[PDB]
Amino acid sequence: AQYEDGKQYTTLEKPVAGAPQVLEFFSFFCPHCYQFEEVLHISDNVKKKLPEGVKMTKYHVNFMGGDLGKDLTQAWAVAMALGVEDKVTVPLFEGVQKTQTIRSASDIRDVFINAGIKGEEYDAAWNSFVVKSLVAQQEKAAADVQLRGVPAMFVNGKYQLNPQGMDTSNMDVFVQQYADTVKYLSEK
Amino acid sequence: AQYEDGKQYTTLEKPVAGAPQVLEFFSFFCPHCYQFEEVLHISDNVKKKLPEGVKMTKYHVNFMGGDLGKDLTQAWAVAMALGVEDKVTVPLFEGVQKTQTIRSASDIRDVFINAGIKGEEYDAAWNSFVVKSLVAQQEKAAADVQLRGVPAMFVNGKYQLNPQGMDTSNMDVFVQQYADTVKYLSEK
């Protein structure tokens, strides 16, 4: 469709170098993020329209939910390291917001075990160098873009999507306008 | 020495006479208020520990959300007048922050109708002078304590909770610590 700077997206004053092509930030404590994931399927729709060779990166943030927010960022790194994102994303969102069975770090471990991950493997991953590095990358990425809130999506480390300037009257149209904006920006 | 001024609570420079025993302020637009209510359940837990005869009052504020902010204060007045607070709190918080489908006074009305309140019953209360007095009461209480931010909780019109002086690694322990402090302050 037609896109205007300052409307469907905004340009960053300081372009982050080496940033992932499409970077999405979220928090398991974030209500609207739960909506984006479970109901709207924003990520899935954006993926369907992305050109060949463009990869989507999704990072968890620390600034929500206090000290537990930090543990979730580490648990997300474990999810990425084990490659079980699609198995634990909804269960974690529900555990924190819906059923409220996740009140501390040990509860996060149970979610993974329930998904079929061995406890020994989870524990080893939790303390791994790979995970400690991933936690560092996530925290740094947020700092580089001076992230103030979630959900958020950045393209080529230069643009940031602005759903507030998008047509929200019809949710099906909205989702497609969002995905089309990402696609348009990824080739700019 | 266990509970100190400046620590888990602060004392008001100018105490409010005639203020409700436990007064909580919030806004449906306030992110931390969503956490407090939907995830932590602060109000419920505090109620469960208050002495016999100590009543809790919850008021909405105007300083967030602009136009819609004031509409929500009037709608909260309607919820109070009709005694349907427990029916509309969740859908209002979710409507504003989770689904972001609440964009005008009409959308707020839809929430009440869907909750079971009759259209004519809602419209009558909405335009009633009883509701206008409830709005004035809410505004007055905020003015009395020079409220500049939410969430906020006051006890006996003298003390204001300071959640910043407590651990948030375990939500259940934080909640219980918050509730215990309110109880302490109420019998002080």
A67 SS3 class = helix
Search chain A and give the residue with CA nearest B39. A97
Q: How far is B135 from chain A (nearest CA, A)?
A: 28
Search chain B and give the residue with CA nearest A69. B169
Q: CATH number, domain at B38?
A: 3.40.30.10
User: How many domains is chain A built from?
Assistant: 1
DSSP code per residue over A1-25: ----BTTTEEE-SSPPTT--SEEEE
Nearest to B98 among A29, A31, A100 (CB): A31
The residue segments making up the domain with residue A59 are 1-188
Q: Is A168 on the interface with B (CB under 8 A)?
A: yes
CB atoms B168 and A67 under 8 Å = yes
Q: How was this structure determined?
A: X-ray
CB atoms B34 and A32 under 8 Å = no
∠ CA A14-A20-A25, rounded to 5°? 85
Nearest to B34 among A31, A39, A67 (CB): A31
CB atoms B39 and A100 under 8 Å = yes
Q: Which residues of B touch A94 (CB under 8 A)?
A: none
DSSP code per residue over chain B: --S-BTTTEEE-SS--TT--SEEEEE-TT-HHHHIIIIII-HHHHHHTTSPTT--EEEEE-SSSSHHHHHHHHHHHHHHHHHT-HHHHHHHHHIIIIIS----SHHHHHHHHHHTT--HHHHHHHHH-HHHHHHHHHHHHHHHHTT--SSSEEEETTTEEE-GGGS--SSHHHHHHHHHHHHHHHHT-
